[PDB]
Every structure is written in C-alpha cells, then in structure tokens.
From Swiss-Prot:
The tandem 7 residues repeats in the C-terminal domain (CTD) can be highly phosphorylated. The phosphorylation activates Pol II. Phosphorylation occurs mainly at residues 'Ser-2' and 'Ser-5' of the heptapeptide repeat. The phosphorylation state is believed to result from the balanced action of site-specific CTD kinases and phosphatase, and a 'CTD code' that specifies the position of Pol II within the transcription cycle has been proposed. Belongs to the RNA polymerase beta' chain family. It comes from Drosophila melanogaster (Fruit fly). The binding of ribonucleoside triphosphate to the RNA polymerase II transcribing complex probably involves a two-step mechanism. The initial binding seems to occur at the entry (E) site and involves a magnesium ion temporarily coordinated by three conserved aspartate residues of the two largest RNA Pol II subunits. The ribonucleoside triphosphate is transferred by a rotation to the nucleotide addition (A) site for pairing with the template DNA. The catalytic A site involves three conserved aspartate residues of the RNA Pol II largest subunit which permanently coordinate a second magnesium ion. This is DNA-directed RNA polymerase II subunit RPB1. DNA-dependent RNA polymerase catalyzes the transcription of DNA into RNA using the four ribonucleoside triphosphates as substrates. Largest and catalytic component of RNA polymerase II which synthesizes mRNA precursors and many functional non-coding RNAs. Forms the polymerase active center together with the second largest subunit. Pol II is the central component of the basal RNA polymerase II transcription machinery. It is composed of mobile elements that move relative to each other. It comes from the Eukaryota. Component of the RNA polymerase II (Pol II) complex consisting of 12 subunits. It is found in: Nucleus. The chain holds residues 1379 to 1427 of 1887 of the full protein. The C-terminal domain (CTD) serves as a platform for assembly of factors that regulate transcription initiation, elongation, termination and mRNA processing.
Amino acid sequence: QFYGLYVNYRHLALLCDVMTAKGHLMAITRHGINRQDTGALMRCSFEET
DNA sequence: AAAAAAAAAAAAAAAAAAAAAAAAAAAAAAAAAAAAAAA
C-alpha cells in the first residue's frame, strides 16, 4: 500500500500460512525450504543440489 | 673400410558483497565430593 498496489487477500494469506505452518519461522531461503520434509528432487531443484 | 663421439630432429610431459549456520575458546556461576576444625 506504500506504492498503491493492490493484491488480493487470499494470495497473501496463503504465503503467511505457508511460513507459519511448521510452528516456527520457515523463511524462503535455502535454510527454510531445504529444511522441510519434502522430497529430495524437489529440494535439489531449488538450491544446493 | 669399420667403429666411436657430438650435434640436431622426434616424442612424451607437466605447468565481490551479504547473510546465516556451525565450530571454538575464554569465562563463569553452580553443584557435588573431599579435607579440616571443633565440640
């Protein structure tokens, strides 16, 4: 809202629920995505293959 | 005319900034165990 851009609430609440799903702060880095419980090929496709 | 030493050609060889997590070392209070004084 500083730049006057409007994004719908669902697309923001989905991200806010993705980060707070595990009970702590799951950042969107290589330290939060690669520390999840997903598959090996999914995690190696992003960073630190 | 046959045998040996030095020079030159051919072939193999080795020489940038940011940010987060983990490891480490000095410190520091706490707690359990051992030695000494007194009743």
